[PDB]
Tab-separated table of C-alpha atoms in Angstrom:
chain	number	residue	atom	x	y	z
A	1	UNK	CA	-6.412	-122.127	-134.777
A	2	UNK	CA	-5.590	-120.831	-138.323
A	3	UNK	CA	-9.002	-120.686	-140.098
A	4	UNK	CA	-9.532	-118.291	-143.018
A	5	UNK	CA	-13.259	-117.713	-143.325
A	6	UNK	CA	-15.138	-116.465	-146.484
A	7	UNK	CA	-18.615	-114.985	-146.950
A	8	UNK	CA	-19.473	-115.824	-150.501
A	9	UNK	CA	-21.998	-113.038	-151.247
A	10	UNK	CA	-20.877	-111.947	-154.715
A	11	UNK	CA	-19.494	-114.006	-157.565
A	12	UNK	CA	-16.212	-112.064	-157.206
A	13	UNK	CA	-16.151	-113.286	-153.612
A	14	UNK	CA	-16.252	-116.954	-154.624
A	15	UNK	CA	-13.807	-116.249	-157.377
A	16	UNK	CA	-11.341	-115.376	-154.642
A	17	UNK	CA	-12.415	-118.350	-152.589
A	18	UNK	CA	-11.463	-120.444	-155.593
A	19	UNK	CA	-8.046	-118.746	-155.535
A	20	UNK	CA	-7.290	-119.598	-151.936
A	21	UNK	CA	-8.151	-123.239	-152.585
A	22	UNK	CA	-6.347	-123.526	-155.918
A	23	UNK	CA	-3.193	-122.359	-154.046
A	24	UNK	CA	-3.147	-125.209	-151.527
A	25	UNK	CA	-0.477	-127.837	-152.290
A	26	UNK	CA	-1.637	-131.030	-150.397
A	27	UNK	CA	0.468	-133.151	-148.043
A	28	UNK	CA	-0.680	-136.504	-146.578
A	29	UNK	CA	1.107	-135.344	-143.472
A	30	UNK	CA	0.092	-131.714	-142.682
A	31	UNK	CA	-3.366	-131.333	-144.342
A	32	UNK	CA	-5.407	-128.223	-145.075
A	33	UNK	CA	-9.174	-128.778	-144.577
A	34	UNK	CA	-11.747	-126.755	-146.578
A	35	UNK	CA	-15.380	-126.703	-145.550
A	36	UNK	CA	-18.486	-125.263	-147.154
A	37	UNK	CA	-21.537	-124.738	-144.994
A	38	UNK	CA	-24.391	-122.268	-144.479
A	39	UNK	CA	-24.287	-119.689	-141.721
A	40	UNK	CA	-25.762	-120.074	-138.272
A	41	UNK	CA	-25.436	-118.254	-134.954
A	42	UNK	CA	-23.563	-121.032	-133.167
A	43	UNK	CA	-20.850	-121.004	-135.877
A	44	UNK	CA	-20.942	-117.246	-136.103
A	45	UNK	CA	-20.226	-117.115	-132.365
A	46	UNK	CA	-17.090	-119.289	-132.645
A	47	UNK	CA	-15.935	-117.264	-135.560
A	48	UNK	CA	-16.228	-114.013	-133.623
A	49	UNK	CA	-14.827	-115.574	-130.424
A	50	UNK	CA	-11.667	-116.781	-132.004
A	51	UNK	CA	-11.323	-113.559	-133.950
A	52	UNK	CA	-11.119	-111.462	-130.839
A	53	UNK	CA	-8.879	-113.905	-129.026
A	54	UNK	CA	-6.543	-113.686	-131.990
A	55	UNK	CA	-6.469	-109.905	-131.797
A	56	UNK	CA	-5.900	-109.870	-128.015
A	57	UNK	CA	-3.359	-112.625	-128.460
A	58	UNK	CA	-1.284	-110.716	-131.010
A	59	UNK	CA	-1.720	-107.327	-129.301
A	60	UNK	CA	-1.752	-107.727	-125.546
A	61	UNK	CA	1.322	-108.818	-123.647
A	62	UNK	CA	0.477	-110.574	-120.383
A	63	UNK	CA	3.049	-110.138	-117.641
A	64	UNK	CA	6.068	-110.511	-119.883
A	65	UNK	CA	4.557	-113.297	-121.981
A	66	UNK	CA	2.582	-113.554	-125.182
A	67	UNK	CA	-0.289	-115.998	-124.902
A	68	UNK	CA	-1.855	-117.617	-127.921
A	69	UNK	CA	-5.607	-117.575	-128.496
A	70	UNK	CA	-6.202	-120.796	-126.580
A	71	UNK	CA	-4.287	-119.580	-123.525
A	72	UNK	CA	-6.294	-116.339	-123.535
A	73	UNK	CA	-9.523	-118.374	-123.820
A	74	UNK	CA	-8.555	-120.121	-120.553
A	75	UNK	CA	-7.759	-116.809	-118.818
A	76	UNK	CA	-11.115	-115.308	-119.943
A	77	UNK	CA	-13.529	-118.181	-119.193
A	78	UNK	CA	-11.762	-118.295	-115.841
A	79	UNK	CA	-12.724	-114.706	-115.037
A	80	UNK	CA	-16.209	-116.035	-115.384
A	81	UNK	CA	-15.962	-119.436	-113.777
A	82	UNK	CA	-13.439	-121.101	-111.530
A	83	UNK	CA	-11.376	-123.983	-112.892
A	84	UNK	CA	-11.646	-127.509	-111.558
A	85	UNK	CA	-8.901	-129.539	-109.954
A	86	UNK	CA	-8.497	-133.343	-110.163
A	87	UNK	CA	-5.432	-135.456	-109.205
A	88	UNK	CA	-2.626	-135.845	-111.734
A	89	UNK	CA	-1.996	-139.348	-113.187
A	90	UNK	CA	1.073	-139.867	-111.033
A	91	UNK	CA	-0.931	-139.164	-107.886
A	92	UNK	CA	1.700	-136.786	-106.566
A	93	UNK	CA	0.221	-133.476	-107.831
A	94	UNK	CA	-2.813	-132.255	-109.567
A	95	UNK	CA	-4.107	-130.857	-112.835
A	96	UNK	CA	-6.467	-127.939	-113.398
A	97	UNK	CA	-9.312	-128.067	-115.873
A	98	UNK	CA	-11.110	-124.894	-117.100
A	99	UNK	CA	-14.708	-124.880	-118.176
A	100	UNK	CA	-15.297	-125.492	-121.908
A	101	UNK	CA	-16.885	-123.006	-124.246
A	102	UNK	CA	-18.557	-126.097	-125.806
A	103	UNK	CA	-21.341	-126.874	-123.347
A	104	UNK	CA	-21.731	-123.110	-122.781
A	105	UNK	CA	-25.122	-121.461	-123.239
A	106	UNK	CA	-25.754	-118.530	-125.581
A	107	UNK	CA	-26.509	-116.250	-122.636
A	108	UNK	CA	-23.306	-117.145	-120.817
A	109	UNK	CA	-21.474	-117.171	-124.104
A	110	UNK	CA	-22.407	-113.589	-124.989
A	111	UNK	CA	-21.009	-112.780	-121.574
A	112	UNK	CA	-17.558	-114.070	-122.426
A	113	UNK	CA	-17.668	-112.216	-125.750
A	114	UNK	CA	-18.563	-109.082	-123.790
A	115	UNK	CA	-15.619	-109.478	-121.448
A	116	UNK	CA	-13.105	-110.056	-124.270
A	117	UNK	CA	-14.317	-106.958	-126.236
A	118	UNK	CA	-14.447	-105.018	-122.972
A	119	UNK	CA	-10.904	-106.012	-122.000
A	120	UNK	CA	-9.412	-105.545	-125.407
A	121	UNK	CA	-10.954	-102.085	-125.597
A	122	UNK	CA	-9.676	-100.651	-122.341
A	123	UNK	CA	-6.290	-101.801	-123.789
A	124	UNK	CA	-7.099	-100.219	-127.133
A	125	UNK	CA	-6.932	-103.408	-129.212
A	126	UNK	CA	-7.427	-103.153	-132.982
A	127	UNK	CA	-10.291	-105.625	-133.586
A	128	UNK	CA	-10.197	-107.268	-136.940
A	129	UNK	CA	-13.299	-107.536	-139.113
A	130	UNK	CA	-14.119	-111.150	-138.311
A	131	UNK	CA	-14.080	-109.758	-134.736
A	132	UNK	CA	-16.359	-106.811	-135.403
A	133	UNK	CA	-18.888	-109.384	-136.655
B	1	UNK	CA	-27.481	-126.602	-147.098
B	2	UNK	CA	-25.688	-129.564	-145.499
B	3	UNK	CA	-22.088	-128.978	-144.414
B	4	UNK	CA	-19.319	-130.318	-146.674
B	5	UNK	CA	-15.732	-131.096	-145.688
B	6	UNK	CA	-12.774	-131.575	-147.998
B	7	UNK	CA	-9.704	-132.451	-146.072
B	8	UNK	CA	-7.070	-131.819	-148.798
B	9	UNK	CA	-4.713	-134.831	-148.860
B	10	UNK	CA	-4.153	-135.041	-152.606
B	11	UNK	CA	-4.615	-132.716	-155.643
B	12	UNK	CA	-7.412	-135.096	-156.677
B	13	UNK	CA	-8.977	-134.206	-153.312
B	14	UNK	CA	-8.214	-130.549	-153.824
B	15	UNK	CA	-9.909	-130.547	-157.240
B	16	UNK	CA	-13.184	-131.719	-155.650
B	17	UNK	CA	-13.116	-128.746	-153.317
B	18	UNK	CA	-12.351	-125.998	-155.764
B	19	UNK	CA	-15.201	-127.314	-157.909
B	20	UNK	CA	-17.575	-127.627	-154.974
B	21	UNK	CA	-16.774	-124.045	-154.059
B	22	UNK	CA	-17.537	-123.148	-157.703
B	23	UNK	CA	-20.833	-124.985	-157.563
B	24	UNK	CA	-21.881	-122.378	-155.003
B	25	UNK	CA	-24.701	-119.889	-155.611
B	26	UNK	CA	-23.700	-116.508	-154.195
B	27	UNK	CA	-26.360	-114.889	-152.066
B	28	UNK	CA	-26.036	-111.469	-150.256
B	29	UNK	CA	-28.981	-112.153	-147.964
B	30	UNK	CA	-28.222	-115.705	-146.709
B	31	UNK	CA	-24.538	-116.196	-147.677
B	32	UNK	CA	-22.689	-119.440	-147.105
B	33	UNK	CA	-19.287	-119.880	-145.486
B	34	UNK	CA	-16.180	-121.496	-147.140
B	35	UNK	CA	-13.693	-121.775	-144.331
B	36	UNK	CA	-10.187	-123.049	-144.988
B	37	UNK	CA	-7.966	-124.168	-142.106
B	38	UNK	CA	-4.387	-125.150	-141.234
B	39	UNK	CA	-3.979	-128.482	-139.503
B	40	UNK	CA	-1.181	-130.061	-137.477
B	41	UNK	CA	-2.867	-133.336	-136.565
B	42	UNK	CA	-4.620	-135.148	-139.367
B	43	UNK	CA	-8.403	-135.185	-139.497
B	44	UNK	CA	-8.444	-138.998	-139.145
B	45	UNK	CA	-5.989	-138.941	-136.215
B	46	UNK	CA	-8.338	-136.737	-134.205
B	47	UNK	CA	-11.236	-139.193	-134.518
B	48	UNK	CA	-8.946	-141.700	-132.797
B	49	UNK	CA	-7.891	-139.339	-130.013
B	50	UNK	CA	-11.477	-138.373	-129.178
B	51	UNK	CA	-12.683	-141.938	-129.409
B	52	UNK	CA	-10.035	-142.854	-126.811
B	53	UNK	CA	-10.730	-139.957	-124.509
B	54	UNK	CA	-14.465	-140.816	-124.877
B	55	UNK	CA	-13.872	-144.458	-124.000
B	56	UNK	CA	-11.777	-143.685	-120.966
B	57	UNK	CA	-14.360	-141.075	-120.136
B	58	UNK	CA	-17.103	-143.645	-120.157
B	59	UNK	CA	-15.155	-146.473	-118.570
B	60	UNK	CA	-12.694	-145.294	-115.941
B	61	UNK	CA	-13.586	-143.122	-112.958
B	62	UNK	CA	-10.945	-140.754	-111.686
B	63	UNK	CA	-10.774	-140.538	-107.890
B	64	UNK	CA	-14.499	-140.418	-107.213
B	65	UNK	CA	-15.891	-138.739	-110.366
B	66	UNK	CA	-16.423	-139.218	-114.102
B	67	UNK	CA	-14.655	-136.823	-116.392
B	68	UNK	CA	-15.562	-135.893	-119.951
B	69	UNK	CA	-13.223	-136.270	-122.898
B	70	UNK	CA	-12.049	-132.694	-122.706
B	71	UNK	CA	-11.222	-133.026	-118.968
B	72	UNK	CA	-9.307	-136.226	-119.733
B	73	UNK	CA	-7.253	-134.546	-122.443
B	74	UNK	CA	-6.054	-132.104	-119.781
B	75	UNK	CA	-5.013	-134.837	-117.331
B	76	UNK	CA	-3.268	-136.735	-120.026
B	77	UNK	CA	-1.605	-133.667	-121.457
B	78	UNK	CA	-0.673	-132.571	-117.966
B	79	UNK	CA	1.254	-135.839	-117.665
B	80	UNK	CA	3.511	-134.891	-120.584
B	81	UNK	CA	3.921	-131.140	-120.348
B	82	UNK	CA	3.650	-129.096	-117.163
B	83	UNK	CA	0.655	-126.785	-117.063
B	84	UNK	CA	1.578	-123.137	-117.285
B	85	UNK	CA	0.400	-120.654	-114.617
B	86	UNK	CA	-0.533	-117.004	-115.176
B	87	UNK	CA	-2.113	-114.000	-113.329
B	88	UNK	CA	-5.870	-113.784	-113.596
B	89	UNK	CA	-7.758	-110.782	-114.992
B	90	UNK	CA	-8.871	-109.352	-111.671
B	91	UNK	CA	-5.234	-109.372	-110.651
B	92	UNK	CA	-5.690	-111.119	-107.364
B	93	UNK	CA	-5.314	-114.716	-108.171
B	94	UNK	CA	-4.027	-117.115	-110.797
B	95	UNK	CA	-5.189	-119.245	-113.670
B	96	UNK	CA	-3.454	-122.463	-114.606
B	97	UNK	CA	-3.456	-123.333	-118.340
B	98	UNK	CA	-2.935	-126.733	-119.935
B	99	UNK	CA	-0.904	-127.262	-123.106
B	100	UNK	CA	-2.566	-126.956	-126.509
B	101	UNK	CA	-2.991	-130.324	-128.187
B	102	UNK	CA	-3.360	-128.385	-131.463
B	103	UNK	CA	0.028	-126.734	-131.140
B	104	UNK	CA	1.622	-130.132	-130.231
B	105	UNK	CA	4.394	-131.454	-132.499
B	106	UNK	CA	4.018	-134.783	-134.280
B	107	UNK	CA	6.476	-136.450	-131.878
B	108	UNK	CA	4.587	-135.225	-128.813
B	109	UNK	CA	1.055	-135.758	-130.082
B	110	UNK	CA	2.161	-139.264	-130.995
B	111	UNK	CA	3.221	-139.705	-127.321
B	112	UNK	CA	-0.125	-138.362	-126.045
B	113	UNK	CA	-1.908	-141.142	-127.963
B	114	UNK	CA	0.509	-143.689	-126.562
B	115	UNK	CA	-0.096	-142.441	-123.010
B	116	UNK	CA	-3.869	-142.556	-123.486
B	117	UNK	CA	-3.642	-146.056	-125.071
B	118	UNK	CA	-1.288	-147.350	-122.384
B	119	UNK	CA	-3.363	-145.876	-119.548
B	120	UNK	CA	-6.607	-147.334	-120.849
B	121	UNK	CA	-4.983	-150.658	-121.544
B	122	UNK	CA	-4.017	-151.463	-117.978
B	123	UNK	CA	-7.464	-150.282	-116.952
B	124	UNK	CA	-9.242	-152.896	-119.008
B	125	UNK	CA	-10.731	-150.282	-121.246
B	126	UNK	CA	-12.636	-151.707	-124.160
B	127	UNK	CA	-11.860	-149.555	-127.205
B	128	UNK	CA	-14.959	-148.448	-129.106
B	129	UNK	CA	-13.111	-147.649	-132.336
B	130	UNK	CA	-11.756	-151.247	-132.611
B	131	UNK	CA	-15.339	-152.463	-131.924
B	132	UNK	CA	-16.714	-150.586	-134.901
B	133	UNK	CA	-13.766	-151.657	-137.125
B	134	UNK	CA	-14.466	-155.285	-136.247
B	135	UNK	CA	-18.206	-154.926	-137.003
B	136	UNK	CA	-17.255	-153.550	-140.452
B	137	UNK	CA	-15.215	-156.674	-141.338
B	138	UNK	CA	-18.051	-158.706	-139.953
B	139	UNK	CA	-20.388	-156.885	-142.456
B	140	UNK	CA	-17.959	-156.955	-145.428
B	141	UNK	CA	-17.557	-160.783	-145.331
């Protein structure tokens, strides 16, 4: 991802929100989407999830490689549930499919969040604020 | 409130957003979120990708079972770029990771859609997006 989130609590807060937006120079090709919406747990979970993944991403090296947030998501959900395997299109190999965080239930979603925080901690990761949510 | 989305494509579009954000009533207690976000693949493009994946999902069965759109994205992406493999957390096995469609370049992403369209085509897949589009012209006239 690359989503800058804002909690408009004070008028100064939204004054800064107006800055961020005013500074976007549009391009029919590579767009920048802005979205207003009220808070809800579901959305607050994905905000916190991606925040930690971003921290772990940027801070933890995995066996000589640096994985992005999406890669780390796959490695984490997989610690909690095995991946599936279906044939590849060519029919001469296979492809693995991890479980999605989408049709994942609060209970088993707080478990993933626990693992990430747990893992990043043993490794002394510096959690951002959106992560300490 | 209801969620609002302003994909910024033109300064005219941008002006709507900065005003909308201004039309907001701050509130410490129940604050609202204004989230901005980078994008590689247009907002409209995506609707097409997921409508395809969905159609294939609904119409073609892969070796004995039906896969959801997400699962089909993997298979299709797997056909273009090799899935990466990495050591699991427990340190006693491995986890295979597909390629990120988000990170994809415009030349690749373009190819993904071609693959999906080509695959569904020889499978007799009826495209839902075209169906809607045709019902819109039917309604206009």
